[PDB]
């Protein structure tokens, strides 16, 4: 079968599922941005922009 390091090659001739995988990647990245901002807001101390 496909070796582990080639599993994603099944996308090469499937534009639809390639677009799906790209959508999922983009979802994951937007989700990371959202999560990261929420975490920073949960930890950020705004009381002293000087020091």
């Amino acid at each position: 079968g496909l070796p582990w390091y080639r599993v994603h090659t099944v996308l090469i001739n499937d534009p639809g599922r390639l677009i799906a995988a790209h959508l999922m990647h983009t979802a994951l990245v937007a989700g990371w941005a959202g999560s990261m901002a929420l975490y920073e807001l949960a930890t950020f101390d705004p009381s002293d922009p000087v020091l």
Binding site: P46, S47, D48, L51
Partner: protein, 121 residues
């Protein structure tokens, strides 16, 4: 000349009475007559809280806050003596009234500041 039912729920009960722009005269004080304040009303419009800086040598400012306990803040129905002193000055001595309100305001960032807004004694 409003009634309770005119007023209830409007938020007007937390507001002090007002005087027209025409009321710019003078109330004569007879030194021999005894005086009283029959009704003193105090309607807070702004609550400022002095910040607490980190370097402790920086000038600390009073900053605006958000009232979070609604229209429950005013002092009213306060009465007391109005004395006419030797030097012509007047001195109000509070004797009774709804002369306090617990108030919670909130600072930018979420910190809540409860205070006993008051003119007791």
């Amino acid at each position: 000349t409003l009634t309770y039912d005119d007023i209830v729920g409007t938020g007007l009960a937390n507001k002090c009475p007002t005087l027209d722009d025409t009321a710019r005269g003078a109330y004569p004080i007879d030194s021999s007559q005894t005086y009283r304040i029959a009704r003193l009303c105090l309607q807070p419009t702004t609550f400022l809280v002095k910040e607490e800086p980190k370097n402790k040598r920086q000038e600390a400012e009073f900053v605006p806050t958000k009232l979070v306990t609604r229209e429950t803040t005013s002092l009213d129905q306060i009465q007391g003596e109005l004395k006419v002193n030797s030097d012509g000055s007047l001195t109000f001595v509070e004797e009774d009234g709804i002369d306090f309100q617990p108030v919670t305001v909130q600072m930018a960032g979420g910190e809540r500041i409860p205070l006993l807004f008051t003119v007791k004694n």
